[PDB]
Amino acid sequence: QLNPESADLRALAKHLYDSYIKSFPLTKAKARAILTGKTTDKSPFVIYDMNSLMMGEDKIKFKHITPLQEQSKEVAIRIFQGCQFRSVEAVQEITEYAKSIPGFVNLDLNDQVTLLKYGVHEIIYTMLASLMNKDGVLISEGQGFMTREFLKSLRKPFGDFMEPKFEFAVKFNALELDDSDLAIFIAVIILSGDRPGLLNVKPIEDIQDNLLQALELQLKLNHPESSQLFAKLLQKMTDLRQIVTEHVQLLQVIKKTETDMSLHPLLQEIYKDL
Template identity: 75%
Template structure:
């Protein structure tokens, strides 16, 4: 998961061979800063939860089962599955973190990840349409290539 590659100061890029600072990210022109900055904010909060691999597996399934993805035709069955996975996530967190009620309340109620996914897909589609017209630094081209 991308959050594991980020901290409050920046993110590892290019398979862990480089580090992009948050200041560098903020200096980028649109849509690059819009693409990555919300993920930094989410990652810092998400990493503070200290979820283990089994927690992450259920959490990621909730994100994958987002009914508001662009191009999705039959939304209701996906939303029903997501509701089931939200219940499973709540149980998983209660079992794995019985002494941390904040974790049990924060993760399931956080509806930001599916929204981030939707925004990410929309921005990537914009990049695909406009990147031919942009004069992009080679380092940024490499980062973008790794994103899609």
Template identity: 55%
Template sequence: NRNKCQYCRFHKCLAVGMSHNAIRFGRMPQSEKLKLRAELQIPEKEERKMQLDDWKTLASQIHEAYLKQFHLNKAKARGFLTGKTDMPPFVIHDLETLQQAQPVLVTQMLSEGREDFAVVQGQETEDRIFHCCQYISVETVTQLTEFAKAVPGFPSLDLNDQVTLLKYGVHEAFFALLASCMNEDGMLVARGSGFITREFLKSLRKPFSDMIESKFQFAMRFNALELDDSDL
């Protein structure tokens, strides 16, 4: 009958709201119950430990890839921004200092040498700075792509999935990285060789000045979290 059929009894208990453990341990003596629970917990603890070890290994691999691919990580950027470096960045705060910084900064940032330098030098101030920002964006996207390739499991995804993940994740990653190079007074450029003040950027014509100012506002809120390179 139904009371003797363990299967029927099991489902009848479930139907009235009893938990699996209550059904399993309900009529078992306390000593047997404790013994069985202890035996069940051992493999669960081992499984949790193995899972934790796997997560730690994955986090370590991602952190190493991050440090390898990004030339100016947060620790290095903080060193420049707090003056804890042997070569402090050249401060650009007006048109004159921008002119003085151009030969060094543009040559370092642009890969094609004097021809590109001549083109940039002939542009208006906003266009020159936009050209530098454009270079930073392209370089960062390249670094993000190489970083993604180093993340375990990413290269094994379908190529279309890889492209989709990069396409929709690149802006969030870019702004998180850009925030590391900013403080309330300005931002680092040319891998830490230069520092453009916030006030100078705000003095540029719109919409460039508004576009940059919104990035500063985000960076201040993001940096308030005090994340380090391993967190990023």
């Protein structure tokens, strides 16, 4: 029965979950509630083509999304500008979450930065899965839903950015994880220790050990019938890396085909020598 040690690991879990809800406006629970439509008040406006996209701007928010524009001959780029600024915002959120992880702020400032530098995108694609289903992704805080088929057409350089995310999403979602799980998983991810350039690895590893211990307990307590979910979830981390590198390769292509498109310093500092 309940051990004194597992007692500490549950508190850590409740803490991270609590911090997660506090740091992320749109949880997986709200996303699913919107997608599985158990509502008449949360249904999103669907974008699957230009006209609906046109209607989209009309029916929903997002002008704050993409700033430097009156438009631009291309929808493909306009969308890119949006997903770009929104990533900026996610780093911001993830960064606020990191600070709540016990021990993270007590680490060397240079290592805190490197952990975020590499962990940010692996985290972004994990959570992005929460907003997806095999047919599309929620947008503008849940008010919209852009179809997977619209995105895959977009163009030639851009109709290839999201497919790998859906690929991972459909599979990662198969694990049926909920917010309380993801909160700890997201923590492990940031607290790697094998991140290129860490000055002091040991302290990071001890924090992760503990976080790994919290996740293990949490996964078995929340999914008793799910055999080896822990091991199965960890293996998923390799799918996140390929998403990342496959993405960077894509970005580099953008930097040449679109010399007129501005990116974003933050995202650039993140990618710089990644």
